[PDB]
Structures are given as C-alpha cells and as structure tokens.
Amino acid sequence: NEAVKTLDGWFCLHDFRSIDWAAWRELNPGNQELMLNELSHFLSDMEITKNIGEGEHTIYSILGQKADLVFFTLRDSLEALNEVENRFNKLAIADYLLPTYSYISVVELSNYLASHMAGGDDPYQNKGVRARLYPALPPKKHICFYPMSKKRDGADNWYMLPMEERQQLIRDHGLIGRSYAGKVQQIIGGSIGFDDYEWGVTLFSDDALEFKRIVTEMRFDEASARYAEFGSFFIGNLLLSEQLSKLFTI
Amino acid sequence: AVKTLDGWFCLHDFRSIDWAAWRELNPGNQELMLNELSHFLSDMEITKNIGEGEHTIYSILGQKADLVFFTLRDSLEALNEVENRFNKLAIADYLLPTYSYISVVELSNYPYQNKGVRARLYPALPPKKHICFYPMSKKRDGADNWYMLPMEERQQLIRDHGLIGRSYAGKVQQIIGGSIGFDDYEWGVTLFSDDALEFKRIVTEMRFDEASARYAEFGSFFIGNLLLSEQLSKLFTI
Amino acid sequence: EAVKTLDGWFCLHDFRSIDWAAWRELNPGNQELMLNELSHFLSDMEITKNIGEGEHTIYSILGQKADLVFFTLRDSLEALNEVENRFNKLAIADYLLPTYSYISVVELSPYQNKGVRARLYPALPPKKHICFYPMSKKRDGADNWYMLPMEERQQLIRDHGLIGRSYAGKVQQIIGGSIGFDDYEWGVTLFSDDALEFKRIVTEMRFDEASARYAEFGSFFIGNLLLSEQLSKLFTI
Amino acid sequence: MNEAVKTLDGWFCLHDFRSIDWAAWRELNPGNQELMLNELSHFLSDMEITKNIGEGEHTIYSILGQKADLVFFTLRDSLEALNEVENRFNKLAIADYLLPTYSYISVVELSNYLASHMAGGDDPYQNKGVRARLYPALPPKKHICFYPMSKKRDGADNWYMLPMEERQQLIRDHGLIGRSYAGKVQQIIGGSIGFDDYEWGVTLFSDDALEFKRIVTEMRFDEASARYAEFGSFFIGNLLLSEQLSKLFTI
Amino acid sequence: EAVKTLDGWFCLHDFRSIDWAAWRELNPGNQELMLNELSHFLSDMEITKNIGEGEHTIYSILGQKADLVFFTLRDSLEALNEVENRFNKLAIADYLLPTYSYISVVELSNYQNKGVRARLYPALPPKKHICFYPMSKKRDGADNWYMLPMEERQQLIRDHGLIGRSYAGKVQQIIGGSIGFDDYEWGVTLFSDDALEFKRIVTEMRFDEASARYAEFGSFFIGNLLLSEQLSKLFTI
C-alpha cells in the first residue's frame, strides 16, 4: 500500500548496434578512415563531458547475434541524452551501426534500505549518495545487461505486498548482492514510465562467471524466485577506443 | 458497464528517421522537403486555431522512434486524411513507421455544453518539456478480472486511483484515450510534464494502488522531449 | 455437446500498406494505367456481387497497421483464392504491401430460408466505418469455455445476444467462424455510421460474462468507407 | 513412475511454406519465366520418381491468405534425404521468387496409446497395414489444413503429469470423434518433440474444407483438446497440380 | 540453497541462413574465392582444436529457421568474440544471414579430475545429427522450481539423470549454463547417429516430473553433420 520512493541520478541509454559488414566492406580505406576519425572526435566529446562530471559512457563488444556493440551513456538530462543520440546517428559511421535494441532508465536509489542517516540533510549533498546516483563506470573486463520487472501474477503480486514485506525481501536480496563485493558491481536504472520493464540492470565484473554465480544465487532468493520477470540478457567485453580501428579493419 | 463521454479522435504516430538515406540527398532537395513539411504543419496549426483539433511533436528517446506526431481531430475521416497527407510528403519516405495508436479522448462516469467537460474532451495540449505515452488494458485473468467486478467495487478502485492522480496536479497532466474497438489495448495514456521524473513517480505510485497492482496490463512506454516546428531544420541538418 | 453451425460465404480480410516511396517514383501516365487496371478489377468484383456469387468492400484503415482493407466474400475457397491471385497480379498490387490477413466463413450457430440466406450470404452495408478483430474463447484453468456444459454456454450466448439486439440500427455484425481456417476461432466484422458505437458495443460486451471471462482478442482495425471515386484522390500525390 | 508414450516412426516430413514475390517475378521477361518454370517442372518430376520407387511422397497446395501462397509438403526416409531436397529446391532459379514464410519438421508418428496391430513378437514395421500409416500415400483431396500443436503443462491442466491409463482414455475418446469422420477427413500426425517448436504437426485432407471446421470444433469440446491442446498457426489450402503452375505464374 | 556449478568452455551456437538469391548473383569465381577464405578460416579453427584450446563443428539445419549452425567452444569470452568477429568479416558471411544465436558455458552442477575436464572441455563427437534447444525452469504459481527446497530438487534431478544415463552411447549431451549470459537458463546440445533418439529421450524426459512440471522450452533445431570438405558442394548451384 505504501509505494517505494527513490532518489534518481543520471539518465541512461543502453544503445545496442550490429555492424553492417557487407556495406562497410564496400568502402575504400580512405573513407573508412574518415569515418573512424569522426567517431574518435565524437568519443573525445564524450570523454570531455565525463571529465567535467556531467556524465559517463563506455563501450562493450556484445557476444552473439543480438548485437556487436553496446554504447552505454549517462547524462544529467533527457535533453542532453537525446542530443547525444542524435549526434551519434548523424555520424557517417552510424549508417553502418544498425539499431538492434535500446533501453532508457535513470540511476535509482530506492528507500527500501537506508543510504544515509535520517535527519533533515539533503541526500543529494551526501557525497557517498552522489557516488551512487552519478556512478563512475569501472573499466571491468565484462558487462552484463538485462531489464526486469516484478510480477503481478495471481498470488505472486509484488505490488500488492505491504511495505515491510517488500523491505524484508529486498533486505535478503541485498545480503546476497553484498556478498559479491569486489567481484560484481551493479548499476540499477529505474525505468517505470520510461521503458518497457521496470528496471534496467547493468553488472560489471572482471570474471563473467561471477554474473552467472550472482544471478543464479539470487534466483533461489524469494525476491527473484517468486517475483522476478526477466527480459533478454546481453554479455560483453570491454572495448577501448584503441581497439576500434582493429575491429573495423577487415 | 461503464459509460463514457467521447471527444477528439487521436493518433499517436511514431517515426524513425532514416539518416542513411537522408544523408544521400543534396542540401537543396533536403530544404525542399523540409519546406513542404513546414507548410503541412502550418496547415495543422490552422486546424488547431479554429478549434477543430490539436497536434504536437516530441523527440523520442531510444531506438523505438525518433519522433512522435500526436494529432487530434473531431472525426476519423479528418484524422485519416491527416495521416495520408503526411505519408504523401516527400520527407515521409525518410520517416519510417515504428508504432501507432488510435484512441478517442474519454471521460468515464465512474454536458457536452459544459465548458469544463469540453476542456477535457477537446484538450488544449500543454507545451510541457516532456511527454510519456503507453497503452494499457485491464486484466481478465483468473481471480484478477476487472470486468467481472461489480460496479460498486470498480467505482471504489477508480476513486482511490483518482486520489493519487489529484496529488500530481500541477506536475503531471494526463490525457486518457479510450481504444476499446479502435486498437489493441483498452486505453492510450499520454502524460505531460516539465520534469520527466514525475512520470516515474506517478506511474510507480499508481502501480502500488490496487486498481493497477492487480488489474493493469501495460504495453510499451515512450518518453520524449518537446520539439517545435522551428527546430526541425536543425534536427534534420546533418 | 459441440455447437453446430450453418456456414455461408468464405471470407478474406486483406490488409495492405501503401508503398508511397515507390509509388512516388512512377510518372503520372503509369500511375493512371495501374489505376485503370484496378478499376477493371473492381468492376469484375462488382459483377460477381450483382449476380449474387459474392461480396466485397474497401475501407481505409487508421494508423500504421494498414492503409486499406479489402474484404471479399465468395462461395468457394477456390474462388476466394483466385480473387487473391488476380489481385496480387495487378500492377498496382506491387505497391500494396501485405500487413495482415484473415480467413473465415460466415457462421450461424434452412439454406432455402430467405432470412437465413440474408445472414449466410450477407449484403455488405455501405456504412461509414468498419471495425475488425479476431477472437477466441479461453481454455485457461477455471475459465475454460470448452469444458462448460451445453446449457451453461447456451445461457452465456443468450445474454450476449441481448446486448447485441440493443444495438439494432447502430451496429451490424458479420461473424466469421475460423476454427480450422485461421489462428483464432472467429473473425468479427462490425459496420456502423458512428465509430463510437464500436467502442460502446465492444465495451458493453466485455462486461458480459461470456466475454469478460472467456474472450481472447487479437488486434483491432478501424476504418472509413473508401468508394472507387475516392481511390484516385488517395493515390494522387 | 510415469510411463512415457512410445512411438513407431515413419517418413521424415517437411512442410515448406512460400510466398510468391510477384513484384520481382513481374520484372522477368516471358522467356526467362518459362525457363525457371521448366527447371521447377524437372525438379517435381524427379520427386515423382522418388515417390514411384517408394522412397517418399510430396504434394503442393495453394494457401489462402497472406501467411503463404504455396506449401510444399515433402516426406522422405531420412533427414539427409529431406535436407537435400530442401537445398536442391532453394537452388532452383525460381526459388528466389518463393520467399520462405514458415516451415515445420516432423516424423510420421504412430503412438502406442491404442494398438495398431496384434501384440506378439512380430516386427510391426513388416505389417503392411502399419506401413501404410507410417509411409502414407498422400490422398489428392481438394483441400489441406496444417497446424502444429502441443499438450499443455499448465497448473492443474498438465498432460505430461497424467498417468498412462488416463492419457489412454483421453486419446481413446479423441479417436472416437476422429473415426466418425472416416471418408470425410484424413489425418497425418507428425511427431516433432526434439525436431521443431511444437510437439506435433497435424495435416488434414478433405474434399470439403468445412469438414476441417467441423472436426476441429467438435474435438475442441473433447476433454483431450479442451483442457490440454495448445495450438499454433492454421494454414488452409487448395490442391495444386504441377500442370497448373504455369497458369498460376502467368501474370 | 542455490546450486553451484563447475564451468568450462564458453560456447557460441551461431545459426545462419544462406542468402541463395544474392549468392546466385555472384560469379563462380567470386564464390570460389569466398569459399577458399572460409576454408582457411576453418582450418585455423582446427589448429585451435588440435592444441586443445577449443572445439567447433558445423551441421546443416533442416527447415527455414537456418541452413547452418556453427558451434564453437573457447576458453574465454574474448577468444569467442574474436572468432565471431573474424567470421562476420569473411566475405562469404555477407551471404550467411544471422537467424539465431546462443551464448552459454559448459556446466557441471553439484547436485583436476581428468574426468571432470572431459565434461567441461568436451570433445565434439562427429555424430551424424545434432539437436539444440534452450530451456529454463518454471517459476509459475505452484510450479516454481526455484522455491523448492534443495532435497526435493535433488530428488527431481536424480530421477532426470536416470533417464539420461539410459541413453548413454546413443545420445551425447552437452549442457551449457546460460543464466546471466542469454535469454534462457540452459542451452542443450544433443548428438546422435539416429535422430529418432532425440525424439525418444526428449519425450521420455517430458513425462518425468522435473521437466513435466518445471521445464520451459525455446525453439528446437535439428541438423546433419557437415564437414568442411562438403561446403563447396553445398554452395555450388
């Protein structure tokens, strides 16, 4: 009956793309170089915004046919995020990066558990809270993304549960997640009102098998076993600018 | 069974921009097509001014769409004519259809001369910075069957739903379009706000209210930023 | 305990999207030739109608699902498929892209009775608007229509019909049975001069137990009557 | 504890649904069209040879609606032979104009819910009546109906949790309805557990398409289907002989 | 309460459909050059197989879902993604259209032991046929695998394994865990010289409670072994 409340940080876009190798193959090397030069300029623009504290971004190569690349971008406004989107699509090389999936969310800190001492202070001025709402992206070797929702299915209805019961379920969920400290970092984007599921979940690790371990362990925790609804899963490997030229060289 | 008052017919027209093909046009042809679109929109502005409809444009975040054209007309004939004349614009070959929704502005009984009722059936569109659209239906699933509830139960559920919505006065404006008989869900919901986080807040709060917790089925969600006709030239300039 | 039906014309709902980008590239003379051929095809349809061997009508569809629906009725599946092939062989059909179709047969849940024939071989009323959607009856746990005893189903059907009778002169329905023919169990076509009547009747029925508990719906399509004269206007950019 | 159904299995089956790309076909001049039709005609006569030496069957139906315009139903004695027919077909020049819209892989199946021959030590695959079912001759009926289906595993309606004697009863009652359509509807059941996305592909043949509606409707009120049937898409079509193809493909 | 797993090679199931119409437009010379490049690519993968750093095989797939599956196993996600990108950059890959893929890791559950290594880093038997499908365990009302206590689940897995052991020598299985990696929880590959053994084992398991009550299935793919030396014949029109 008591709705969850959230603190909300950067707006987020997960932008998945497949490379149109057949078309790219037809460009002569000089034109490929010009397009990669322009992309490097765009990416340095991204880096400038990161270095003044106004957003974040990273790129991972995606395994399988769902995508070749994910561009994960965070900005302080939907206007800025959409401007990045348009600037990217207007790049010459974007004609060769075909959209296969996207997700819009906002970094979310819910109030199921406390993130700071109660008592009148502005949480947005708490620098530990800020480090979570406006997260620096760890350059971990692997990324995992998937959206999810909470079930509203007969006797398994998360949104009919009272606050104290949801708090208990989230608390137990967090005990598992905290046991992966130093092995898995999570960024939770809330997407109710913004996209097709209720959260977009990003995990970072140097060992992709930690994704399998934590997701499996949580699936036996009642919060997920009874109430999790999952979308598609995407797994990838860190892709640094220095590796893009190689990737786009046939 | 609920009864309703019904206002303007509505089209949400979602479009993706085909940049790769647009890029191949020389600047003169791009300008010609944008000028044709500009006259199309000024003709829609006239219809808006004479009180025979409304329309607005928002840029859409993510890959679902680049633009939404939200048009309201007093007849399905007029609405279909707008749609066909839009599709026949040269520039429409570069605006690819990704999703659409058809509905009618709805006011339930949970009069047409009443000026306050008219303001809702024939709504002026607020030029808010952000839009949110999603369709939804009510469940008919085992023990969670909205349409098997007696009228008094549904009236209580709607009443509690409305109390939440009233607490967002001044922060979120809603247009509810009925679509039973017209499209694949039962309502199209359009929200307008200067702060997109208010969409997240109102939709989350309603999801813990029984009327939605037990009975709501949701389609896809679209969020966007207001786009004025005068900004189209810049958007389409590569 | 299974229902028995009387069966009439075989029906095709053929939804098409207009490929404006390609159509735009045709010079005016070629557009005119293709419209001339289409006008010949439609007069062929009209001849079958006028000798009592079928029916047909065209409506413009709102939204992106389709631009046009061609609703054709014929006395055999061979004749229905032949119309289909003739239509797709038209030059202009290259610009009418297929987006959805439905196959059904007009259903009454005797064949010399004139009143029955008027239902099995229905004249299409030239109403301003059309509504189409397919549906099935649920087989879902405790909401299982096909496990109900005949007398229960009969009662549910009765109350459904009372609602329908109250829309006499506002909505005309054609019910096509499609069990064995398409992906749902019925195709429902509604005709009216006031499209809000579609919303009213479908909503009122959805609160009736027959639909509230047991109805499963496909996509809905709503449209406006398109006469031959208005086709030339439509296809003139 | 729970006894799984056992099956006898015959020819492997491909239902290959295709849509005609009239816009592309229209751009060919008559000489090149006739030539691609000639190649198709030779292909079909080679299939006819395979049928005549008892190594398979095949038939063609025109499909109503937009799901497809044609179905090529092919039966062969091995998956290697079936896949070679498929590839050889796709390599026909005309196949570029026959766009794939749906396919189904199955194997002609005779379950052991009811007996097909007297118990004993005899090899059923030498029983000529059993063979007539496992390696079915295709009747040249005017109409075909195809749809895949599965049995539900959904809460209290779980077919695969039922004991054998209860499933036997349900199938027995199903068969009583089916046998009442003797001379009106012929069925070929292809099992596809492990081979495709549903558990069976069902093909019906009849000279009156309304018998399809009649039998399927009547069965849907039988408990075996009312409680446990899960249905895919339905396809209905009209017999198309090879000699009718030139007329079909003449614009 | 949660299962713990040993994890071996990372796996890619890469399903492709041949674009026959585009391939037909190529002159035989270009076709041969593209097939030569593919042959070199495959022989490089054979080297990786011979030094024990991975595995791969190719099967032709029945029906329209695909024409080929490329099944590749590598010791890192970096090495797997590199194979994938190298493949897509082959000229011939423009004619091998992607129709489905699966990412998993060979999994041994706890429900250098040289015998363990033979399962985690499996040699691929050159069986005449392959079967692939993904699956998950249900979390649906009263049929919720992940809410069962460990002892119940262990019993269900025990009975499941008895069935699998009775097919030893006829069916070889590779179970890939995919929780966190793809859309289902496992990818299941079966190998056999008799495709009917796929139907027999999968059917028999479906009447076992572990699958009857709790298994959720994706699409099924079946195919015939395709050696590198047979590719020229397949692609020659």
Ligand code: FEC
């Ligand atoms: C992995 C993974 C998933 C997705 C798969 C699954 O849930 O089965 C996953 C799913 C979710 C989902 C939805 C939610 C939103 C729940 C809601 O608001 O109803 C959601 C929400 C939370 N998670 Fe979560 N998670 N999660 C971690 C990993 C995963 N988490 C790790 C690691 C940590 C530990 C890091 C940290 O301290 O924040 C962690 C902690 C939290 C906390 C903080 C609670 C606490 O501190 O006690 C909240 C709130």
Ligand code: FEC
């Ligand atoms: C947002 C949103 C949704 C979408 C569903 C969701 O769970 O997100 C949403 C959904 C629906 C739906 C269906 C219905 C139709 C009920 C039915 O006929 O089943 C539906 C119907 C009503 N709503 Fe609704 N809403 N809603 C608001 C926002 C949202 N509303 C705000 C704000 C207000 C407050 C407006 C005000 O009173 O000033 C508000 C009020 C009403 C009133 C009473 C208004 C009046 O006449 O006074 C009726 C009736």
Ligand code: FEC
């Ligand atoms: C509209 C609409 C639907 C769509 C379902 C929905 O919930 O939207 C709709 C749905 C169905 C469906 C299925 C069936 C058949 C299901 C079955 O179990 O046989 C089905 C069958 C019948 N309907 Fe129906 N309808 N329906 C009307 C409109 C609609 N109807 C109007 C109007 C009338 C009143 C006209 C009259 O009195 O003749 C009317 C009456 C009947 C009668 C009684 C007349 C007769 O003998 O045929 C039968 C039987």
Ligand code: FEC
């Ligand atoms: C039509 C139709 C369907 C699909 C619609 C539905 O609701 O099932 C249909 C569906 C199925 C399905 C699955 C199965 C698989 C059962 C299982 O193994 O679970 C399945 C299996 C069988 N069917 Fe079936 N059918 N079916 C007929 C028509 C239809 N049948 C006609 C006709 C006959 C009459 C046979 C003849 O004499 O030629 C007939 C007979 C059998 C027999 C033989 C039983 C007996 O002889 O007593 C078995 C086994």
Ligand code: FEC
């Ligand atoms: C575990 C688990 C799953 C997935 C669900 C879950 O994790 O709860 C799981 C899934 C499957 C699936 C599908 C199939 C294929 C057919 C099917 O019903 O889908 C399937 C088929 C087989 N399994 Fe299976 N399993 N499985 C074990 C555990 C699991 N198994 C353990 C254990 C062993 C015994 C190995 C050991 O521990 O020493 C074992 C053995 C086999 C053998 C025989 C192998 C052999 O003799 O070498 C076959 C055939």
Ligand SMILES: [Cl-]
């Ligand atoms: Cl902390």
Ligand code: NA
């Ligand atoms: Na990839």
Ligand code: NA
């Ligand atoms: Na703030």
Ligand code: NA
């Ligand atoms: Na966008």
Ligand code: NA
């Ligand atoms: Na339209």
Ligand code: NA
């Ligand atoms: Na057809």
Ligand code: NA
């Ligand atoms: Na290699």
Ligand code: NA
């Ligand atoms: Na194939």
